[PDB]
Amino acid sequence: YQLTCYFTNWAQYRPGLGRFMPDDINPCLCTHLIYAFAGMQNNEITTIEWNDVTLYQAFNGLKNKNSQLKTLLAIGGWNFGTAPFTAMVSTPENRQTFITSVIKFLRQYEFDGLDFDWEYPGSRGSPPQDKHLFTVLVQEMREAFEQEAKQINKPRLMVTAAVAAGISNIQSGYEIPQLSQYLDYIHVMTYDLHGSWEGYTGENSPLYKYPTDTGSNAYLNVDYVMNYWKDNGAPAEKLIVGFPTYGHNFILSNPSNTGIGAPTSGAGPAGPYAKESGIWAYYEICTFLKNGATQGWDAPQEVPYAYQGNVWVGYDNVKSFDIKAQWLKHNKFGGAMVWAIDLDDFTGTFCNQGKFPLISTLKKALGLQSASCTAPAQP
C-alpha cells in the first residue's frame, strides 16, 4: 500500500508549537511526500513563497534517510483558481512550454514527480472544454516524462492528480477511463464532505451515509465516492483514499440539539494555530477535548464528533482512521493520502497519543515496511 502525505508551505507561519518545517517530517512515516503548492507565471511552473527553494532542499533531503521515499511537487490549490490552468491547456504550444518548465524544475530541485491540484477542470470558473483538455495535458506530460527518462538515463518522473469527491464536479471534470491510463496515482479528496456552509452539522469525512441521507446527500461519504471512481474507469490500485487530519466546526443554533443535521448559525471559530475559519487541526481538537468537550460517536458513519456549549466539531481520530484504513484494504484500494502532515499532532504534546498519532495509525494499518530507513555505523 501507499501512504502519501501532503506538506503545506504555509505551515511555517504558525506560532509556537504550530510551526511546521520540512525537517519536522519523520522520513520513515510516509511512502510519498507531496509539497503544496507551486504556482505559475507565463505558462511556466514557479515557487510561491519567498523561501520555497530552501524548503525544497530540506524537503527532498529527507530522501537521504529513506531509500524508498519519493517526493512530488503539487501545482495549484484552492486560492490559485482555474484561470491559469485554463489558459495553459488552451493551446498545444502553451502545454509544451509548461511541460518543459516542469521537467526542468523537478530535476533542478530533486523532486520525483508532479501532482496536479487543479480544483477543478469543468467547474469553479473553468469552462466545459477543460474536462477533455486535462486528459490531453496529462497524456502529454506522461509522454514527455517517458521520453526524458531515456534522454537522461534515469527513472521516469511521476505524474499524479488530486481529484474531486463531489459527484457533479467529477462528472463535469474528468474523462475517467482515459485519464486513469496516464496518471500514476489518483488522490481522491474525500474530505470537506460537509461544513457550516450547509447550515447544519455534518461530518468532514464520513465512511458511510447517515441513515437519513437521501438523494444527492447519499453521495457524501467515502464509500460512495471511492466506488464511483472505481465503477467508472479508475483502477483500484491507482485510487488513493483521502484522509483528513483536521475537522470542521460549527456554531449550534440550539445548544440542546447536538446530533448530525442539527441547525447551525455559522462556522465555528478558527483556532490560534492554523487560524482557518470553520476548521481545527487535529491537535487543536485535542485542546477542545482537554477543556471538557463531550465526545460523541456517529456510529452509522464511523466517525467521532464533539461539542461544548454552542460549539460543535466533526472530525477524525485514531479509531476512525483505523476503521477506514481497514475498509480501504478490504476494497483493495492503492492506499491512503493525508491532508495534511502538519495538521496531525506532530509534537505529540496536544493529544497524549505519541508523535503523529493519526498518520502512525495509517502506517501500522497499511503494514508499511521500514527497512529502507536503515542507518549504518558510519558518521
CSV table of C-alpha atoms in Angstrom, one decimal:
chain,number,residue,atom,x,y,z
A,1,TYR,CA,0.0,0.0,0.0
A,2,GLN,CA,0.9,3.7,-0.5
A,3,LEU,CA,0.9,6.3,2.2
A,4,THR,CA,1.1,9.8,0.7
A,5,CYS,CA,1.4,12.8,3.0
A,6,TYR,CA,0.9,16.4,1.8
A,7,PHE,CA,3.1,19.1,3.4
A,8,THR,CA,2.0,22.7,3.1
A,9,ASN,CA,4.4,25.6,2.6
A,10,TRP,CA,2.3,28.0,4.7
A,11,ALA,CA,2.5,25.9,8.0
A,12,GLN,CA,5.9,27.7,8.5
A,13,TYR,CA,3.9,30.8,9.6
A,14,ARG,CA,2.0,29.3,12.5
A,15,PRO,CA,3.0,30.4,16.1
A,16,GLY,CA,4.9,28.4,18.7
A,17,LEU,CA,4.2,24.7,18.6
A,18,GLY,CA,2.2,25.1,15.4
A,19,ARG,CA,5.2,25.9,13.2
A,20,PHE,CA,6.0,23.0,10.8
A,21,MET,CA,9.0,22.9,8.6
A,22,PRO,CA,10.2,20.2,6.2
A,23,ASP,CA,12.7,18.9,8.9
A,24,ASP,CA,9.7,18.2,11.2
A,25,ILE,CA,8.7,15.3,8.9
A,26,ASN,CA,9.6,11.8,10.0
A,27,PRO,CA,11.2,10.4,6.8
A,28,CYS,CA,10.1,6.9,7.7
A,29,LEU,CA,6.5,7.7,8.3
A,30,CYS,CA,5.1,8.0,4.7
A,31,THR,CA,5.9,6.4,1.4
A,32,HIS,CA,5.3,9.5,-0.7
A,33,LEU,CA,5.5,13.2,0.3
A,34,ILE,CA,3.8,16.0,-1.7
A,35,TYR,CA,4.8,19.7,-1.4
A,36,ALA,CA,1.9,22.1,-1.7
A,37,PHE,CA,1.9,24.3,-3.6
A,38,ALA,CA,3.8,25.5,-6.7
A,39,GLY,CA,2.4,28.4,-8.9
A,40,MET,CA,2.5,29.5,-12.5
A,41,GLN,CA,3.8,32.5,-14.5
A,42,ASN,CA,3.5,32.8,-18.3
A,43,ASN,CA,2.7,29.1,-18.5
A,44,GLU,CA,5.7,28.0,-16.5
A,45,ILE,CA,5.9,26.4,-13.0
A,46,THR,CA,7.1,28.7,-10.2
A,47,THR,CA,7.6,29.0,-6.5
A,48,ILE,CA,5.0,30.8,-4.3
A,49,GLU,CA,6.8,31.5,-1.0
A,50,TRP,CA,10.0,33.6,-0.7
A,51,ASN,CA,11.9,30.6,0.9
A,52,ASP,CA,10.5,27.8,-1.2
A,53,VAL,CA,13.9,26.9,-2.7
A,54,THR,CA,15.3,26.4,0.8
A,55,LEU,CA,12.3,24.4,1.9
A,56,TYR,CA,12.6,22.2,-1.4
A,57,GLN,CA,16.2,21.4,-0.4
A,58,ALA,CA,15.2,20.3,3.1
A,59,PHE,CA,12.1,18.5,1.8
A,60,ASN,CA,13.9,16.5,-0.8
A,61,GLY,CA,16.9,16.0,1.5
A,62,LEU,CA,14.7,13.7,3.6
A,63,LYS,CA,15.2,11.0,1.0
A,64,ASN,CA,18.8,10.6,2.2
A,65,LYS,CA,17.2,8.9,5.3
A,66,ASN,CA,14.7,6.7,3.4
A,67,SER,CA,15.8,5.0,0.2
A,68,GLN,CA,12.2,4.2,-0.9
A,69,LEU,CA,10.7,7.7,-0.1
A,70,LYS,CA,9.5,9.6,-3.2
A,71,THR,CA,8.7,13.3,-3.4
A,72,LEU,CA,6.3,15.2,-5.6
A,73,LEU,CA,5.5,18.9,-6.1
A,74,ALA,CA,1.8,19.9,-6.2
A,75,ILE,CA,0.8,22.7,-8.5
A,76,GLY,CA,-2.4,24.7,-7.9
A,77,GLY,CA,-4.6,24.6,-4.8
A,78,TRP,CA,-7.8,26.5,-3.8
A,79,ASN,CA,-6.6,30.1,-3.9
A,80,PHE,CA,-4.8,29.6,-7.3
A,81,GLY,CA,-8.2,29.1,-9.0
A,82,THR,CA,-8.8,27.8,-12.5
A,83,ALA,CA,-7.9,30.7,-14.9
A,84,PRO,CA,-4.1,29.9,-15.2
A,85,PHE,CA,-4.8,26.2,-15.9
A,86,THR,CA,-7.5,27.1,-18.5
A,87,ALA,CA,-5.1,29.4,-20.4
A,88,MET,CA,-2.2,26.9,-20.2
A,89,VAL,CA,-4.1,24.0,-21.6
A,90,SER,CA,-5.8,26.0,-24.3
A,91,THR,CA,-3.1,25.5,-26.9
A,92,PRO,CA,-0.5,22.7,-27.5
A,93,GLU,CA,2.2,25.4,-27.6
A,94,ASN,CA,1.4,26.6,-24.0
A,95,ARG,CA,1.2,23.0,-22.8
A,96,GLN,CA,4.7,22.2,-24.2
A,97,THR,CA,6.1,25.3,-22.6
A,98,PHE,CA,4.6,24.3,-19.2
A,99,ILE,CA,5.7,20.7,-19.5
A,100,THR,CA,9.3,21.7,-20.5
A,101,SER,CA,9.3,24.1,-17.5
A,102,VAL,CA,8.1,21.3,-15.1
A,103,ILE,CA,10.7,18.7,-16.2
A,104,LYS,CA,13.4,21.3,-15.7
A,105,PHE,CA,12.0,22.5,-12.3
A,106,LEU,CA,11.6,19.0,-10.8
A,107,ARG,CA,15.1,17.9,-11.9
A,108,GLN,CA,16.7,21.1,-10.6
A,109,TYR,CA,15.2,20.8,-7.1
A,110,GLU,CA,15.3,17.0,-7.0
A,111,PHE,CA,11.5,16.1,-6.9
A,112,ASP,CA,10.4,12.7,-8.2
A,113,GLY,CA,7.2,13.9,-9.8
A,114,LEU,CA,4.3,16.4,-10.2
A,115,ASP,CA,0.9,16.3,-8.5
A,116,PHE,CA,-1.9,18.2,-10.3
A,117,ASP,CA,-4.1,20.2,-8.0
A,118,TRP,CA,-6.5,21.9,-10.4
A,119,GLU,CA,-9.7,22.5,-8.5
A,120,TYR,CA,-11.3,21.7,-10.9
A,121,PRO,CA,-11.5,21.3,-14.6
A,122,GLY,CA,-15.0,22.0,-15.7
A,123,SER,CA,-16.1,23.7,-12.5
A,124,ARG,CA,-15.4,26.7,-10.2
A,125,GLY,CA,-14.8,29.0,-13.2
A,126,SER,CA,-13.3,26.5,-15.6
A,127,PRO,CA,-15.1,26.1,-19.0
A,128,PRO,CA,-16.5,22.7,-20.3
A,129,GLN,CA,-13.6,22.1,-22.7
A,130,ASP,CA,-11.2,21.8,-19.8
A,131,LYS,CA,-12.5,18.3,-18.9
A,132,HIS,CA,-11.1,16.9,-22.1
A,133,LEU,CA,-8.0,19.3,-22.2
A,134,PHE,CA,-7.0,18.0,-18.8
A,135,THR,CA,-6.8,14.5,-20.2
A,136,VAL,CA,-4.7,15.8,-23.1
A,137,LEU,CA,-2.4,17.7,-20.7
A,138,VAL,CA,-1.9,14.6,-18.5
A,139,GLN,CA,-1.3,12.5,-21.6
A,140,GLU,CA,1.4,14.8,-23.0
A,141,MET,CA,3.0,15.2,-19.5
A,142,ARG,CA,3.3,11.4,-19.1
A,143,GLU,CA,4.7,11.1,-22.7
A,144,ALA,CA,7.3,13.8,-22.1
A,145,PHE,CA,8.3,12.2,-18.8
A,146,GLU,CA,8.7,8.8,-20.5
A,147,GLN,CA,10.9,10.4,-23.2
A,148,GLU,CA,13.0,12.5,-20.8
A,149,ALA,CA,13.8,9.3,-18.8
A,150,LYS,CA,15.5,7.8,-21.8
A,151,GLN,CA,17.3,11.1,-22.5
A,152,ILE,CA,19.0,11.5,-19.1
A,153,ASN,CA,19.1,7.7,-18.3
A,154,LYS,CA,17.1,8.0,-15.0
A,155,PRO,CA,13.8,6.5,-13.8
A,156,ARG,CA,10.7,8.4,-15.1
A,157,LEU,CA,9.2,11.3,-13.2
A,158,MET,CA,5.8,10.5,-11.8
A,159,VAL,CA,2.5,12.2,-12.7
A,160,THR,CA,-0.4,12.2,-10.3
A,161,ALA,CA,-3.5,14.3,-9.5
A,162,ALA,CA,-5.7,15.3,-6.6
A,163,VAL,CA,-9.3,15.0,-7.8
A,164,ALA,CA,-12.9,16.0,-6.8
A,165,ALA,CA,-15.1,13.9,-4.4
A,166,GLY,CA,-18.3,15.8,-5.4
A,167,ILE,CA,-20.3,13.8,-8.0
A,168,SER,CA,-21.3,16.8,-10.2
A,169,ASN,CA,-17.7,18.1,-10.1
A,170,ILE,CA,-16.4,14.6,-11.0
A,171,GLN,CA,-18.9,14.3,-13.9
A,172,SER,CA,-18.0,17.8,-15.3
A,173,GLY,CA,-14.3,17.4,-14.7
A,174,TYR,CA,-12.8,14.1,-15.8
A,175,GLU,CA,-12.8,11.5,-18.6
A,176,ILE,CA,-12.1,8.8,-16.0
A,177,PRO,CA,-11.2,5.7,-18.1
A,178,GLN,CA,-8.8,7.6,-20.4
A,179,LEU,CA,-7.3,9.8,-17.7
A,180,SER,CA,-6.6,6.8,-15.5
A,181,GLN,CA,-4.3,5.3,-18.1
A,182,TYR,CA,-1.8,8.2,-17.8
A,183,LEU,CA,-1.9,9.1,-14.1
A,184,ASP,CA,0.3,7.0,-11.8
A,185,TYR,CA,-1.9,7.8,-8.8
A,186,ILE,CA,-5.3,9.4,-8.3
A,187,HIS,CA,-5.6,11.2,-4.9
A,188,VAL,CA,-9.3,11.5,-4.2
A,189,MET,CA,-10.1,14.4,-1.9
A,190,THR,CA,-12.7,12.5,0.3
A,191,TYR,CA,-13.0,15.3,2.8
A,192,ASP,CA,-14.9,18.6,3.3
A,193,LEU,CA,-17.9,16.4,2.5
A,194,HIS,CA,-19.9,18.6,5.0
A,195,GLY,CA,-19.3,22.1,6.5
A,196,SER,CA,-21.0,25.1,8.1
A,197,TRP,CA,-21.7,26.3,4.5
A,198,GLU,CA,-24.6,23.8,4.5
A,199,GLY,CA,-26.3,25.4,7.5
A,200,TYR,CA,-26.4,22.2,9.7
A,201,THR,CA,-24.0,19.8,11.4
A,202,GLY,CA,-22.3,17.1,9.3
A,203,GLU,CA,-19.1,15.0,9.2
A,204,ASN,CA,-15.9,16.0,7.3
A,205,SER,CA,-15.1,12.5,6.0
A,206,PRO,CA,-17.8,10.0,7.0
A,207,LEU,CA,-17.2,6.5,5.8
A,208,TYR,CA,-20.8,5.7,5.1
A,209,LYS,CA,-24.0,7.7,4.6
A,210,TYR,CA,-26.1,8.8,7.6
A,211,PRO,CA,-29.3,6.7,7.8
A,212,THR,CA,-31.5,9.8,6.9
A,213,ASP,CA,-29.2,10.7,3.9
A,214,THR,CA,-31.4,10.7,0.7
A,215,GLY,CA,-30.9,11.8,-2.9
A,216,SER,CA,-27.6,13.6,-3.6
A,217,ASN,CA,-26.8,13.7,0.2
A,218,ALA,CA,-26.4,10.0,0.0
A,219,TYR,CA,-23.2,10.5,-2.1
A,220,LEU,CA,-21.4,12.5,0.6
A,221,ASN,CA,-19.3,9.7,2.1
A,222,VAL,CA,-16.0,7.9,1.4
A,223,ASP,CA,-17.7,4.6,0.5
A,224,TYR,CA,-19.8,6.1,-2.3
A,225,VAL,CA,-17.2,8.4,-3.8
A,226,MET,CA,-14.4,5.8,-4.0
A,227,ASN,CA,-16.8,3.3,-5.5
A,228,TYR,CA,-17.9,5.9,-8.1
A,229,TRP,CA,-14.3,6.3,-9.3
A,230,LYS,CA,-13.8,2.5,-9.4
A,231,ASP,CA,-17.1,1.8,-11.3
A,232,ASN,CA,-16.4,4.5,-13.8
A,233,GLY,CA,-12.9,3.5,-15.0
A,234,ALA,CA,-10.2,4.2,-12.4
A,235,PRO,CA,-8.0,1.1,-11.4
A,236,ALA,CA,-8.4,0.3,-7.7
A,237,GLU,CA,-4.6,0.2,-7.2
A,238,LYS,CA,-4.2,3.7,-8.6
A,239,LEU,CA,-7.0,5.1,-6.3
A,240,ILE,CA,-5.8,6.7,-3.1
A,241,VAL,CA,-8.3,7.4,-0.3
A,242,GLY,CA,-8.2,10.9,1.2
A,243,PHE,CA,-7.7,11.1,5.0
A,244,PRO,CA,-8.2,14.5,6.8
A,245,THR,CA,-6.1,15.4,9.9
A,246,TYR,CA,-8.5,18.2,10.7
A,247,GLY,CA,-12.2,18.7,11.2
A,248,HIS,CA,-14.9,21.3,10.6
A,249,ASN,CA,-16.5,23.3,13.4
A,250,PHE,CA,-20.0,24.9,13.6
A,251,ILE,CA,-22.0,27.2,15.8
A,252,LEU,CA,-25.0,25.4,17.1
A,253,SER,CA,-28.3,27.4,16.6
A,254,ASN,CA,-29.7,25.5,19.6
A,255,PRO,CA,-27.1,24.1,22.1
A,256,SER,CA,-29.6,21.4,23.2
A,257,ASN,CA,-29.6,19.8,19.7
A,258,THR,CA,-26.1,18.2,19.2
A,259,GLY,CA,-26.9,15.5,16.6
A,260,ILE,CA,-26.0,15.1,12.9
A,261,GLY,CA,-28.1,17.5,10.9
A,262,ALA,CA,-28.7,19.9,13.8
A,263,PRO,CA,-29.2,23.6,12.7
A,264,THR,CA,-26.2,25.8,12.7
A,265,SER,CA,-25.8,29.6,12.5
A,266,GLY,CA,-22.3,29.8,11.1
A,267,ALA,CA,-18.7,28.5,11.0
A,268,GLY,CA,-17.1,27.7,14.3
A,269,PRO,CA,-14.0,29.7,15.3
A,270,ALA,CA,-10.6,29.5,13.8
A,271,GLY,CA,-8.0,28.1,16.2
A,272,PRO,CA,-5.0,30.1,17.4
A,273,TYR,CA,-2.5,27.9,15.4
A,274,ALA,CA,-4.0,27.2,12.0
A,275,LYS,CA,-6.2,30.3,12.0
A,276,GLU,CA,-8.6,28.8,9.5
A,277,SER,CA,-12.3,29.7,9.8
A,278,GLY,CA,-14.6,26.7,10.5
A,279,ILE,CA,-11.5,24.4,10.8
A,280,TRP,CA,-9.5,22.9,13.7
A,281,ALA,CA,-6.3,20.9,13.2
A,282,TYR,CA,-6.4,17.6,15.0
A,283,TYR,CA,-4.1,19.0,17.7
A,284,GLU,CA,-6.4,22.0,18.1
A,285,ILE,CA,-9.3,19.5,18.6
A,286,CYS,CA,-7.3,17.7,21.3
A,287,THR,CA,-7.3,21.1,23.2
A,288,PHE,CA,-11.1,21.2,22.8
A,289,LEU,CA,-11.4,17.7,24.4
A,290,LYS,CA,-8.9,18.7,27.2
A,291,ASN,CA,-11.3,21.6,28.0
A,292,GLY,CA,-14.1,19.1,28.8
A,293,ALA,CA,-16.0,18.8,25.5
A,294,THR,CA,-18.5,15.9,25.3
A,295,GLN,CA,-17.3,13.1,23.0
A,296,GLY,CA,-19.8,11.5,20.6
A,297,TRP,CA,-19.6,8.6,18.2
A,298,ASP,CA,-21.5,8.9,14.9
A,299,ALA,CA,-21.8,5.1,14.6
A,300,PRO,CA,-23.5,4.7,11.2
A,301,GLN,CA,-20.8,6.8,9.6
A,302,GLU,CA,-17.9,5.5,11.7
A,303,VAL,CA,-16.5,9.0,12.7
A,304,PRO,CA,-16.4,10.9,16.0
A,305,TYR,CA,-17.8,14.3,16.9
A,306,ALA,CA,-17.5,16.6,19.9
A,307,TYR,CA,-19.3,19.6,21.4
A,308,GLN,CA,-19.1,22.2,24.2
A,309,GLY,CA,-21.9,24.6,24.7
A,310,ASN,CA,-22.7,26.2,21.3
A,311,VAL,CA,-19.6,24.8,19.5
A,312,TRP,CA,-19.7,21.5,17.6
A,313,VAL,CA,-16.9,19.8,15.6
A,314,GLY,CA,-17.0,16.9,13.2
A,315,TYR,CA,-13.6,15.2,12.7
A,316,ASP,CA,-11.4,12.1,12.6
A,317,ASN,CA,-9.5,10.3,15.3
A,318,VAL,CA,-7.3,7.2,15.7
A,319,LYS,CA,-10.5,4.9,15.8
A,320,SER,CA,-12.0,6.4,12.6
A,321,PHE,CA,-8.7,6.4,10.7
A,322,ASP,CA,-8.1,2.7,11.6
A,323,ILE,CA,-11.7,1.8,10.6
A,324,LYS,CA,-11.3,3.5,7.2
A,325,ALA,CA,-7.8,2.0,6.7
A,326,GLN,CA,-9.2,-1.5,7.3
A,327,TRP,CA,-12.1,-0.7,4.9
A,328,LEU,CA,-9.6,0.5,2.2
A,329,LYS,CA,-7.8,-2.8,2.4
A,330,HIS,CA,-11.0,-4.9,2.1
A,331,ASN,CA,-11.8,-3.0,-1.0
A,332,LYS,CA,-8.3,-3.2,-2.4
A,333,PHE,CA,-7.5,0.5,-3.0
A,334,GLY,CA,-3.9,1.6,-3.5
A,335,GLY,CA,-3.6,3.3,-0.1
A,336,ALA,CA,-4.2,6.5,1.8
A,337,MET,CA,-3.3,10.1,1.3
A,338,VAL,CA,-3.2,12.7,4.1
A,339,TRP,CA,-4.3,16.4,4.2
A,340,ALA,CA,-2.1,17.3,5.9
A,341,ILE,CA,1.0,16.1,7.7
A,342,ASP,CA,1.4,19.5,9.5
A,343,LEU,CA,-2.2,19.2,11.0
A,344,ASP,CA,-1.6,15.9,12.9
A,345,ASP,CA,-0.3,16.2,16.5
A,346,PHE,CA,3.3,16.2,15.2
A,347,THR,CA,4.9,17.3,18.5
A,348,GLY,CA,2.8,14.8,20.4
A,349,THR,CA,2.1,17.4,23.1
A,350,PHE,CA,-1.6,18.1,22.5
A,351,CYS,CA,-3.2,14.6,22.3
A,352,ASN,CA,-1.1,12.3,24.5
A,353,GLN,CA,-1.1,9.7,21.8
A,354,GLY,CA,2.5,9.8,20.7
A,355,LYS,CA,4.0,11.9,17.8
A,356,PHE,CA,2.0,11.8,14.6
A,357,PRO,CA,-0.9,9.7,16.2
A,358,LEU,CA,-3.2,9.8,13.1
A,359,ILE,CA,-0.6,9.1,10.5
A,360,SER,CA,1.2,6.5,12.6
A,361,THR,CA,-2.2,4.7,12.7
A,362,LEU,CA,-2.2,4.5,8.9
A,363,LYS,CA,1.4,3.3,8.8
A,364,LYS,CA,0.5,0.5,11.2
A,365,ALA,CA,-2.8,-0.4,9.5
A,366,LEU,CA,-1.3,-0.5,6.0
A,367,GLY,CA,1.7,-2.6,7.1
A,368,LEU,CA,4.4,-0.3,5.7
A,369,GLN,CA,7.9,-1.6,5.7
A,370,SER,CA,10.7,0.4,7.4
A,371,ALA,CA,13.8,-1.5,6.1
A,372,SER,CA,14.5,1.4,3.7
A,373,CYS,CA,15.1,3.8,6.6
A,374,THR,CA,18.1,1.9,7.8
A,375,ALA,CA,21.1,3.8,9.1
A,376,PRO,CA,24.7,2.4,9.4
A,377,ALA,CA,27.5,2.8,11.8
A,378,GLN,CA,29.0,5.4,9.5
A,379,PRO,CA,29.1,9.0,10.8
